[PDB]
Design a protein around this ligand. Structure first.
Ligand code: GTP
Ligand code: MTN
Ligand code: MTN
Ligand code: MTN
Ligand code: MTN
Ligand code: MTN
Length: 180
């Protein structure tokens, strides 16, 4: 009775994963979310609020909400509505000038008690740019090797084409597998 009823409870919980997309106002959170969700790159613009996206992958229903990464939006991050199982931090690779802003911004999100249970998947955007930063530089500067207190990873992605985007959704789904 205890085990059975449990298996019945997962019916309205399993097969569905919650995702969040945020960060800097110039990283390209909107560009990627639309590429993996719509499969095609469209005209992106500064998002002033949040935008949910229903996408299906491997029989699962990944929900990716894209909230403005701007400073003025930073506060809005506390209106996610508690549900995101994993987050997707977008960091511009070709923009070394702000490379510290993105790093410092994620820290604020990572230092939040209200977000100490959500994931932090980092995806270096603008990788398609001829001067796109390598994973070694973005990782080192971000203290990836020095940070082992929060589940976060760095991945090189190109939203303009969408390469590597699929792999990201696959890596996350494996990390939870419900049981986790
Ligand atoms: N070439 C290229 N440009 C990109 C890519 N992702 C974003 N951009 C550029 O970034 C700008 C818009 O990106 P956004 O998706 O609005 O960036 P954001 O992280 O959503 O920031 P806000 O929406 O302002 O909070 C445009 O100039 C796009 O061309 C990418 O993968 N490749
Ligand atoms: S997830 C698709 C979705 C739901 C609803 C709000 C009903 N709209 O029709 C869109 C397509 C945005
Ligand atoms: S979720 C795994 C999946 C199902 C199916 C369509 C049968 N394919 O084999 C993949 C691996 C895409
Ligand atoms: S996280 C707050 C909230 C959301 C929902 C899943 C509907 N829960 O029932 C509560 C009210 C705790
Ligand atoms: S981040 C999840 C959460 C918040 C807080 C109340 C600070 N706790 O540490 C839990 C893990 C319950
Ligand atoms: S989140 C990492 C992950 C989940 C689980 C399937 C439980 N495994 O232990 C790995 C490490 C693959």
């Amino acid at each position: 009775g205890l085990f059975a009823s449990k298996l019945f409870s997962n019916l309205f919980g399993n097969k569905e994963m919650r995702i969040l997309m945020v960060g800097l106002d110039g990283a390209g959170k909107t560009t990627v979310l639309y590429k993996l969700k719509l499969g095609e790159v469209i005209t992106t613009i500064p998002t002033i609020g949040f935008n949910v996206e229903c996408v299906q992958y491997c029989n699962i229903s990944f929900t990716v909400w894209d909230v403005g990464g701007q400073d003025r939006i930073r506060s809005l991050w506390r209106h996610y509505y508690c549900n995101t199982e994993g987050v997707i931090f977008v960091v511009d690779s070709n923009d070394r000038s702000r490379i510290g802003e993105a790093r410092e911004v994620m820290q604020r999100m990572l230092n939040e008690d209200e977000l100490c249970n959500a994931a932090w998947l980092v995806f270096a955007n603008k990788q398609d740019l001829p001067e796109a930063m390598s994973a070694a530089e973005i990782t080192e500067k971000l203290g990836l090797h020095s940070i082992r207190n929060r589940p976060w990873f760095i991945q090189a992605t190109c939203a303009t084409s969408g390469e590597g985007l699929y792999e990201g959704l696959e890596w996350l789904s494996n990390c939870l597998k419900n049981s986790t």
